[PDB]
Amino acid sequence: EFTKEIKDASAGLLAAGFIAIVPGYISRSVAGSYDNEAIAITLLMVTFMFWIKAQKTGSIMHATCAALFYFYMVSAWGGYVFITNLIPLHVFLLILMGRYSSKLYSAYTTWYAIGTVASMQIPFVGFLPIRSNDHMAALGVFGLIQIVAFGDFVKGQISTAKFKVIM
Amino acid sequence: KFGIKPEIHHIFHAEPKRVAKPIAVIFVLIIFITILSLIVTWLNSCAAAFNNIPTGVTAVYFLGFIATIVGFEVIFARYYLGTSIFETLFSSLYLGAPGLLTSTKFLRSFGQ
Amino acid sequence: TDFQETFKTSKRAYFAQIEKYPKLKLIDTFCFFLVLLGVIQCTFIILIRDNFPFNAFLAGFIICVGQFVLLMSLRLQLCNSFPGISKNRAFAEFIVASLILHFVCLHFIN
Amino acid sequence: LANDEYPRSWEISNSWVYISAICGVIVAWIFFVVSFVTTSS
Amino acid sequence: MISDEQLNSLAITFGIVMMTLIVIYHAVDSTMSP
Numbered sequence: 433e434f435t436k437e438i439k440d441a442s443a444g445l446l447a448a449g450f451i452a453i454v455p456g457y458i459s460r461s462v463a464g465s466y467d468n469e470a471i472a473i474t475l476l477m478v479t480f481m482f483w484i485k486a487q488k489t490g491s492i493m494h495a496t497c498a499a500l501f502y503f504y505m506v507s508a509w510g511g512y513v514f515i516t517n518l519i520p521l522h523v524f525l526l527i528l529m530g531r532y533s534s535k536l537y538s539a540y541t542t543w544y545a546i547g548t549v550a551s552m553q554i555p556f557v558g559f560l561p562i563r564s565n566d567h568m569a570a571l572g573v574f575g576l577i578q579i580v581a582f583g584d585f586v587k588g589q590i591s592t593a594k595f596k597v598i599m
Numbered sequence: 600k601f602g603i604k605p606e607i608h609h610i611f612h613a614e615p616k617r618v619a620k621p622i623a624v625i626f627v628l629i630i631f632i633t634i635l636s637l638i639v640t641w642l643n644s645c646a647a648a649f650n651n652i653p654t655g656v657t658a659v660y661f662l663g664f665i666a667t668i669v670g671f672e673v674i675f676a677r678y679y680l681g682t683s684i685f686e687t688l689f690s691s692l693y694l695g696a697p698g699l700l701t702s703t704k705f706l707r708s709f710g711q
Numbered sequence: 712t713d714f715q716e717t718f719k720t721s722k723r724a725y726f727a728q729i730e731k732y733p734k735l736k737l738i739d740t741f742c743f744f745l746v747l748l749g750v751i752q753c754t755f756i757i758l759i760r761d762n763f764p765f766n767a768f769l770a771g772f773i774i775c776v777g778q779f780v781l782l783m784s785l786r787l788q789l790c791n792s793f794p795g796i797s798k799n800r801a802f803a804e805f806i807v808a809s810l811i812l813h814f815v816c817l818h819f820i821n
Numbered sequence: 822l823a824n825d826e827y828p829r830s831w832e833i834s835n836s837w838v839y840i841s842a843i844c845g846v847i848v849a850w851i852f853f854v855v856s857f858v859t860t861s862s
Numbered sequence: 863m864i865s866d867e868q869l870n871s872l873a874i875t876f877g878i879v880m881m882t883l884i885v886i887y888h889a890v891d892s893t894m895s896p
């Protein structure tokens with residue numbers, strides 16, 4: 433489904449056929465292996481699939497069920513931190529390139545809202561996403577996405593010669 | 600060696616103080632005055648009032664819609680006081696299955 | 712370069728944009744009083760010196776920040792609609808997102 | 822202590838502000854959805 | 863129960879049937895799509 437969101441589905445079946453039997457994932461996915469990365473990658477790919485599917489169309493629902501599988505990815509594995517430094521790294525690279533839209537706001541800001549009020553309920557991860565140095569990229573991009581939203585309101589309303597002296 | 604030994608009583612940790620209570624009462628009715636300011640701003644004063652009410656045969660899907668929206672907050676409000684996660688989960692299942700059909704025929708009935 | 716044209720001009724565009732569409736009035740005044748509840752809780756944490764539960768503060772605070780977030784994410788879909796998403800599908804997703812945020816914030820208040 | 826066997830949020834004198842504000846956002850949300858549906862744009 | 867060489871033949875024949883019908887799907891898709 434992820435590669436179906438990147439290209440046509442005929443590349444999705446190649447990616448599924450690759451990751452079904454690849455030796456890099458079958459190492460940590462052997463038959464007797466209850467070692468907590470058996471459930472991690474099957475939530476990394478559902479998380480990323482609903483994130484890309486939420487950022488294409490700008491839907492609120494796909495970015496809330498991206499955050500439910502983000503929460504259920506936090507409940508499982510301790511390398512959830514990767515996601516909360518990759519989805520903000522994606523959105524931020526969407527800001528520097530000038531590819532901001534209302535879809536990118538309307539996806540990211542509800543991903544951060546639901547996914548950060550929800551991942552705080554696991555007792556191993558307490559108020560750490562408020563005061564850890566690795567969850568600050570998400571609160572930083574959640575910070576400046578407001579400024580790009582309001583600035584994006586004033587750029588499309590005042591003329592270009594006064595708009596060039598703003599950014 | 601043998602003989603009597605001095606006692607030990609395990610001096611406990613101190614708990615941080617809670618709050619002065621009428622300060623908390625003051626902020627409770629400040630938030631009450633703010634929410635009542637919101638409702639009194641909505642209903643008549645800013646004229647964002649009830650322009651249309653579907654009094655036809657699609658009124659029952661509107662009352663079903665209010666039954667779902669108020670119903671999930673009744674379920675969550677019961678979950679706030681006791682009421683373990685499984686009985687809440689079957690409660691919102693038994694509301695969410697008939698309730699999603701009568702909250703979608705309504706939004707099919709209104710194209711705005 | 713005093714930016715006197717900015718606040719007056721955007722004041723005319725926004726302040727003209729409010730009463731032409733009756734639903735954006737609901738959205739932005741409800742956003743404004745959400746900002747007032749965030750300010751009231753923040754000055755409660757300033758007025759006394761402790762944040763003693765600290766899950767109650769982030770419960771009552773992240774419900775207001777998150778609800779403001781979902782309201783802006785609906786106003787952006789009513790002002791200029793997204794391609795694959797209708798205006799009625801713009802609203803049910805707000806309802807589902809708001810009910811999920813209300814559940815997690817009533818779980819996090821304990 | 823279990824997660825249930827804690828001092829409750831309505832019991833504690835400090836958390837009345839946040840219960841009142843969460844209840845305010847919820848009731849104002851219910852009048853927001855009923856007022857939003859029943860208005861005409 | 864199945865042996866280990868017979869499981870090796872089963873795993874390899876699922877891999878070969880898998881990649882074969884993937885290539886057939888990609889050929890039929892790439893030829894007959896606008």
Ligand SMILES: *[C@@H]1O[C@H](CO)[C@@H](O[C@@H]2O[C@H](CO)[C@@H](O[C@@H]3O[C@H](CO[C@H]4O[C@H](CO)[C@@H](O)[C@H](O[C@H]5O[C@H](CO)[C@@H](O)[C@H](O)[C@@H]5O)[C@@H]4O)[C@@H](O)[C@H](O[C@H]4O[C@H](CO)[C@@H](O)[C@H](O)[C@@H]4O[C@H]4O[C@H](CO)[C@@H](O)[C@H](O)[C@@H]4O[C@H]4O[C@H](CO)[C@@H](O)[C@H](O)[C@@H]4O)[C@@H]3O)[C@H](O)[C@H]2NC(C)=O)[C@H](O)[C@H]1NC(C)=O
Pocket residue numbers: 607608609610
């Ligand atoms: C990871 O695992 C680790 C290993 O399993 C674990 O580490 C261990 O943790 C425990 C728990 O804290 C440690 O026990 C404490 O150790 C203290 C160290 O004191 C040193 O220095 C003192 C002089 O400054 C020495 O007296 C002391 O003991 C020596 O003498 C003993 C008798 O002669 C002898 O057996 C020893 O081998 C050693 O030679 C040591 O060298 C120690 O001070 C402390 O004792 C107090 O607490 C005990 C109960 O916890 C009481 O039984 C004891 O009598 C002392 O009580 C005082 O404190 C209580 C409250 O804490 C009060 O209720 C008492 O009334 C009393 O209070 C008096 O003193 C207070 C000042 O301290 C004062 O405020 C009061 O008013 C009153 O005057 C205890 O034994 C242990 O040492 C650690 N071991 C190692 C190897 O590190 C670690 O905890 C684990 N990690 C986690 C996260 O759990």
Ligand SMILES: CCCCC/C=C\C/C=C\CCCCCCCC(=O)O[C@H](COC(=O)CCCCCCCCCCCCCCC)COP(=O)([O-])OCC[N+](C)(C)C
Pocket residue numbers: 500503504507550553554555671678679680681682683684685691807810811814815818821824825
């Ligand atoms: C529009 C529809 C909206 C419906 C909303 C429904 C869900 C919202 C989505 C996400 C919410 C996230 C918050 C988690 C709440 C549950 C915690 C709980 O249940 O444990 C709580 C205790 O907490 C905890 O220790 C933390 C436990 C963390 C749970 C870890 C499991 C996650 C993985 C589950 C997936 C399993 C496979 C399923 C595959 C799909 C028990 O509570 P209790 O039984 O004591 O109840 C009494 C309620 N007092 C106490 C408030 C009165």
Ligand SMILES: CCCCC/C=C\C/C=C\CCCCCCCC(=O)O[C@H](COC(=O)CCCCCCCCCCCCCCC)COP(=O)([O-])OCC[N+](C)(C)C
Pocket residue numbers: 863864
């Ligand atoms: C999502 C699709 C899933 C795709 C495949 C998934 C997993 C396959 C991977 C590994 C499988 C290897 C098997 C290891 C165990 C060895 C046992 C063995 O080999 O049995 C062999 C024989 O078997 C067979 O003739 C197989 C028979 C036909 C198989 C039919 C497929 C089952 C599906 C039916 C479901 C229909 C319902 C439809 C619902 C919609 C004998 O063994 P025995 O001597 O121990 O019997 C004990 C000795 N008696 C004989 C005396 C009892």
